[PDB]
Amino acid sequence: HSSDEEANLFAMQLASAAVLPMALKAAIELDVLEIMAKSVPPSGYISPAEIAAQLPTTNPEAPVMLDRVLRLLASYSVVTYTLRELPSGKVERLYGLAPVCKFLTKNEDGVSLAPFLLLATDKVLLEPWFYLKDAILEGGIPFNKAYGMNIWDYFGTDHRINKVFNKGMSSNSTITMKKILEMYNGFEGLTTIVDVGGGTGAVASMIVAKYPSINAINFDLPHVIQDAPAFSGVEHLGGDMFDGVPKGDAIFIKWICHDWSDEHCLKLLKNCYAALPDHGKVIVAEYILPPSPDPSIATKVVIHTDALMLAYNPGGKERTEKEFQALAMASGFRGFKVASCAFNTYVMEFLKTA
Amino acid sequence: IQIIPTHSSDEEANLFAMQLASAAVLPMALKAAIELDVLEIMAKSVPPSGYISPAEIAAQLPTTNPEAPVMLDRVLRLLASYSVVTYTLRELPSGKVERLYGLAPVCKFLTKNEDGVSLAPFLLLATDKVLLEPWFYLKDAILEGGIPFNKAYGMNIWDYFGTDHRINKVFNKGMSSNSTITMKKILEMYNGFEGLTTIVDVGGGTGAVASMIVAKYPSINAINFDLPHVIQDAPAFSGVEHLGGDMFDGVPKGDAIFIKWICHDWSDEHCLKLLKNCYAALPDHGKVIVAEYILPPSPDPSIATKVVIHTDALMLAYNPGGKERTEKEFQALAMASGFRGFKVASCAFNTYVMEFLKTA
Numbered sequence: 245h246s247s248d249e250e251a252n253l254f255a256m257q258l259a260s261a262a263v264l265p266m267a268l269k270a271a272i273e274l275d276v277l278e279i280m281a282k283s284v285p286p287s288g289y290i291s292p293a294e295i296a297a298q299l300p301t302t303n304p305e306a307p308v309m310l311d312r313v314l315r316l317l318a319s320y321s322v323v324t325y326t327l328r329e330l331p332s333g334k335v336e337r338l339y340g341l342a343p344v345c346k347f348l349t350k351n352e353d354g355v356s357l358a359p360f361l362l363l364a365t366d367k368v369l370l371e372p373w374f375y376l377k378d379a380i381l382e383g384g385i386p387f388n389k390a391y392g393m394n395i396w397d398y399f400g401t402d403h404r405i406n407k408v409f410n411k412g413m414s415s416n417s418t419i420t421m422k423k424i425l426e427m428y429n430g431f432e433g434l435t436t437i438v439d440v441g442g443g444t445g446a447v448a449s450m451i452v453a454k455y456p457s458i459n460a461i462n463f464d465l466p467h468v469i470q471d472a473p474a475f476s477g478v479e480h481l482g483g484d485m486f487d488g489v490p491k492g493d494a495i496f497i498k499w500i501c502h503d504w505s506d507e508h509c510l511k512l513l514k515n516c517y518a519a520l521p522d523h524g525k526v527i528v529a530e531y532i533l534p535p536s537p538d539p540s541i542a543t544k545v546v547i548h549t550d551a552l553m554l555a556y557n558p559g560g561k562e563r564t565e566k567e568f569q570a571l572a573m574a575s576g577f578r579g580f581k582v583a584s585c586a587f588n589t590y591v592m593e594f595l596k597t598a
Numbered sequence: 599i600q601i602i603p604t605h606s607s608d609e610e611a612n613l614f615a616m617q618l619a620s621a622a623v624l625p626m627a628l629k630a631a632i633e634l635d636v637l638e639i640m641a642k643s644v645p646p647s648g649y650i651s652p653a654e655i656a657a658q659l660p661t662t663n664p665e666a667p668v669m670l671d672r673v674l675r676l677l678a679s680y681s682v683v684t685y686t687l688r689e690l691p692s693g694k695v696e697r698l699y700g701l702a703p704v705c706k707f708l709t710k711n712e713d714g715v716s717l718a719p720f721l722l723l724a725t726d727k728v729l730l731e732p733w734f735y736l737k738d739a740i741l742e743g744g745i746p747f748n749k750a751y752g753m754n755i756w757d758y759f760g761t762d763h764r765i766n767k768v769f770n771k772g773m774s775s776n777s778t779i780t781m782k783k784i785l786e787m788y789n790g791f792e793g794l795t796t797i798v799d800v801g802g803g804t805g806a807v808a809s810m811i812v813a814k815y816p817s818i819n820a821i822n823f824d825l826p827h828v829i830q831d832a833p834a835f836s837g838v839e840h841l842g843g844d845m846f847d848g849v850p851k852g853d854a855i856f857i858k859w860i861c862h863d864w865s866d867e868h869c870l871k872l873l874k875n876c877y878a879a880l881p882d883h884g885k886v887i888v889a890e891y892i893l894p895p896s897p898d899p900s901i902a903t904k905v906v907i908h909t910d911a912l913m914l915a916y917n918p919g920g921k922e923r924t925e926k927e928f929q930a931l932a933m934a935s936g937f938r939g940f941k942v943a944s945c946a947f948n949t950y951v952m953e954f955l956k957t958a
């Protein structure tokens with residue numbers, strides 16, 4: 245029918261679906277979205293030739309090649325567009341920023357999700373996808389099949405991707421934690437907080453900024469900590485969390501549990517229980533898997549991240565709120581609180597006492 | 599109506615940026631599903647309910663990996679979120695809920711039909727490592743000029759396919775399966791091949807289209823013309839004469855020349871050179887039959903438009919000046935190469951069939 249026509253066209257759209265994130269990657273790497281944000285008012289539009297005039301190029305085709313990339317981004321509403329008729333009767337397009345561009349260009353604090361997109365579309369993280377069929381048939385982890393070691397060991401050998409990853413995570417966490425800290429009061433009154441797997445320390449620096457008397461420890465692998473900027477109030481410390489974690493009044497773990505199997509999460513969580521005082525807690529910041537494969541963007545983000553963990557991590561996966569309760573119970577915690585949520589990230593507390 | 603920025607609108611904007619960041623997971627997970635034969639296993643193995651569990655799928659894979667079922671479930675859950683497959687939920691003994699899966703309407707074109715073809719080989723082409731590589735050179739092409747594919751490989755795509763036998767095969771089969779489906783539909787509706795003595799398919803690939811034309815019109819002389827490395831492989835279809843060459847030098851003579859998905863591979867200058875060659879290869883009453891997408895008036899959100907604009911982005915990555923064109927632009931190419939008549943004759947699956955008529 246028109247029915248068969250629609251099914252065929254959707255199949256073609258799926259086949260070429262990687263054109264969208266790769267076009268967007270090129271637009272971000274060329275600084276297009278920043279040039280648009282600084283060159284016209286928030287509600288205005290700019291031509292591809294005026295954008296290209298701010299790139300360091302003499303390529304006569306740069307305007308049309310940008311138009312082609314921007315038209316693909318416009319079709320998905322990543323940028324806005326308006327049409328302007330030409331004397332020939334042909335029409336050209338001028339482009340503006342759509343609401344998603346607020347998160348793809350630097351905000352008042354100089355952060356966005358653009359480094360996160362540059363991480364997600366890096367050649368290094370695309371390669372494991374070619375080994376997913378093998379891992380399903382033969383066992384194993386697609387990343388390890390591509391690289392011969394686990395991802396964190398690999399990042400300790402490839403300095404470029406270590407920095408790309410750490411910056412991707414730091415920028416994404418800055419945006420999420422800025423929102424959580426406006427709503428969540430669970431750090432108030434702590435003497436010491438430990439960010440286990442804290443990366444380059446962005447979250448711990450924001451906690452100490454909000455609560456200047458808190459003593460904060462940012463704990464991660466030593467190839468990450470070596471790149472961590474100094475921040476007043478934060479002590480950076482290298483190590484392996486599965487051997488033990490630093491003591492504190494609370495331990496914060498953001499996007500750690502979803503990297504690991506249930507068994508490895510229990511080992512880590514018991515190390516955290518051992519590190520806390522009797523009345524201490526673990527503050528767990530993670531997505532929560534929805535109950536069905538619904539088409540919403542928020543659910544797609546979680547299920548995309550579940551698929552990433554499948555490709556990258558040994559046993560990592562997304563979990564439901566009950567599955568998080570089960571991890572807390574089996575590692576000895578007695579209370580469980582869903583305390584706040586921001587950009588899909590829920591903040592749960594695993595309380596040693598209830 | 600103006601949407602006033604709020605917490606709620608900022609959540610949706612943030613999440614769409616995260617979805618974009620990881621959007622390649624969808625075609626790469628669908629690639630793995632197809633390579634594992636999961637959609638074919640589902641099509642052939644429905645219980646009479648029409649829904650199958652990941653364990654039941656896994657049981658049919660050449661595997662003894664006991665994590666295969668849960669791995670499949672996770673892949674299928676991403677596919678189901680995008681309506682590539684369907685699901686149903688069933689409550690387990692422990693009170694946990696399991697998913698069972700079914701084929702969604704798109705799967706009619708991702709599994710073999712009655713003629714044994716689908717768009718599955720096209721998806722394997724589009725997601726092949728070789729064709730993902732040029733995307734890392736897109737920013738370079740914009741800043742330096744040139745072609746992302748040539749920056750990755752040090753030669754043009756056709757030259758590269760002549761050096762890499764595995765990808766040449768993957769490409770020729772992706773195109774022949776796709777073109778078989780579209781051509782079957784065009785041949786039901788379009789009458790322009792009737793009464794021709796000789797048809798030349800220029801850039802015909804392995805010749806699937808020429809073989810369809812002669813099957814329908816057994817009195818026609820059919821020539822399949824392409825590069826020697828494509829022709830070498832090509833099935834010896836009854837009634838098709840294969841000829842290797844380079845179309846920019848010239849093309850075989852015929853009453854009509856058919857070019858499907860050729861113009862969109864090449865710059866305007868290249869197209870003018872090709873279409874002048876065609877003009878010279880035709881009798882006075884001859885025509886070029888051109889099967890291509892047509893760019894819509896605006897970058898609207900429809901799937902049909904998106905397909906054309908995805909293909910425009912594929913041509914930017916792969917091809918020497920290739921791009922999608924509007925009907926007015928195809929008309930301008932026809933006039934600029936000497937043709938006096940132009941008509942849009944038919945359309946199937948977004949592919950329009952245009953005729954460039956030597957005499958109007």
Ligand SMILES: Nc1ncnc2c1ncn2[C@@H]1O[C@H](CSCC[C@H](N)C(=O)O)[C@@H](O)[C@H]1O
Pocket residue numbers: 396413414417440441442443444463464465468483484485486497498499500503
């Ligand atoms: N065995 C281990 N000990 C300590 N940290 C580890 C680890 N294995 C992995 N990690 C760290 O776990 C972090 C996971 S990514 C999450 C980073 C940060 N919490 C955020 O949300 O931005 C990485 O920084 C990684 O280096």
Ligand SMILES: Nc1ncnc2c1ncn2[C@@H]1O[C@H](CSCC[C@H](N)C(=O)O)[C@@H](O)[C@H]1O
Pocket residue numbers: 756773774777800801802803804823824825828843844845846857858859860863
């Ligand atoms: N210079 C040239 N002369 C002849 N054919 C060429 C050519 N350069 C590229 N091609 C061919 O152009 C075809 C483009 S792909 C489209 C193939 C076929 N018409 C279909 O629609 O299925 C390929 O088969 C390629 O080898």
Ligand SMILES: COc1cc(/C=C/CO)cc(OC)c1O
Pocket residue numbers: 363364365369395499500503549552556557619620
């Ligand atoms: C492997 O560690 C992670 C990798 C990735 C992979 C990012 C590439 O899209 C994402 C994460 O949070 C979503 C992680 O904790």
Ligand SMILES: COc1cc(/C=C/CO)cc(OC)c1O
Pocket residue numbers: 259260723724725729755859860862863909912916917
């Ligand atoms: C190199 O020429 C083509 C490449 C491609 C690339 C297919 C991979 O998505 C598609 C075509 O028709 C759509 C072409 O004529």
